[PDB]
Amino acid sequence: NLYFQSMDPTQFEERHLKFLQQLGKGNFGSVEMCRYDPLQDNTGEVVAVKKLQHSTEEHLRDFEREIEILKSLQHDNIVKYKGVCYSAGRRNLKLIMEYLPYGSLRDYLQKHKERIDHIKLLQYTSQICKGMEYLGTKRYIHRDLATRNILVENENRVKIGDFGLTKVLPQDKEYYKVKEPGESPIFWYAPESLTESKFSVASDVWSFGVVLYELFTYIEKSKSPPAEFMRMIGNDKQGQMIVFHLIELLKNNGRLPRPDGCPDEIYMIMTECWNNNVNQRPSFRDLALRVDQIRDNMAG
Ligand SMILES: CCS(=O)(=O)N1CCN(c2ccc(Nc3ncc(C(N)=O)c(NC4CC4)n3)cc2)CC1
């Protein structure tokens, strides 16, 4: 009470934060591109600015947690925290982060196939695993790993973003049981997350297997995880029946198919990530090493 938590409300002052562009919607919120131009000279750093879409009390609390999580992370493959802007005369909050010009990896794979080959896909895979290794050291569970939530700086660098669903493991447990769920990205979820609301490093590994699938499908029409799972389940199914059939399919070894042109060895990594036995899934350290060895074992 006596002394409020340390904040730097003069680091990004609203009057100097200039709108450049609307970018998109990250889990609970909206993101814009702005320029921070304190020397009112039409220059300054270009930044991404996340704001809430519905500024309820509960959402503001969740947003504070997301901000504290991101501020605690510093890694080449994690989107950079820059600060907070307390706008509306210090009666609102916005998160200031670095801006990555190529947007989401999901969009980049679709818009920039001219510059993507398997080498690049494996580089992105490696980078994602290394970011995730780093999150694990902090006991953070991302809970929404998907190509839509990975951002592209340039042809040789991607970074994990969207920490809006991230949870911190309890001190004494290796899983977090989410007792509030929102809308869930079910087609990226591990079976124990679907059936028990349990999230862990190992369920992030499951979702990483889906990301690896996404990369090798090159975000092709009809090959997305939702499209393929719905084809397997029955495209006419609606509502909870979808979830019931997804659970049953996964529990009895139904899996996304090997993408066209995907090496068997990469599909094997996917299928090892998609182990119903939580403890048998590889670690992110295992995966980064394996992917880098595959890359390094190529000629040259
Ligand atoms: C060509 C198809 S397009 O015309 O439809 N199109 C594609 C490119 N694009 C775009 C989106 C984001 C970014 N950069 C970015 N940087 C950092 C963050 C961050 N720190 O969260 C972020 N978050 C947002 C992802 C929520 N977004 C750059 C470009 C929107 C318009």
Author numbering: 833 to 1132
Question: What's in the article?
Answer:
Janus kinase (JAK) family of nonreceptor tyrosine kinases consists of JAK1–3 and TYK2 (tyrosine kinase 2) that serve as triggering kinases for cellular signaling of over 50 cytokines and hormones in regulation of blood and immune cells and metabolism. JAK2 activity is crucial for hematopoietic signaling particularly in homomeric myeloid, and hormone receptors and activating mutations of JAK2 have been identified in multiple malignancies, most notably Philadelphia chromosome-negative myeloproliferative neoplasms (MPNs), where mutated JAK2 drives the disease manifestations. MPNs are clonal neoplastic diseases initiated in the bone marrow from a mutated hematopoietic stem cell.
Cerdulatinib makes three hydrogen bonds to the hinge region: two to main chain carbonyl oxygens of Glu930 and Leu932 and one to main chain amide of Leu932. The binding of momelotinib, ilginatinib, cerdulatinib, and lestaurtinib is mainly driven by enthalpy. The exceptions to this are cerdulatinib, which has an amide in this position, allowing more rotational freedom, and gandotinib, which has a methyl group at the same position. Most inhibitors did not show significant binding to pseudokinase domains, except for cerdulatinib, AT-9283 and pacritinib, which demonstrated one- or two-digit nanomolar affinities for the pseudokinase domains of JAK1 (cerdulatinib, AT-9283) and/or TYK2 (cerdulatinib, AT-9283 and pacritinib).
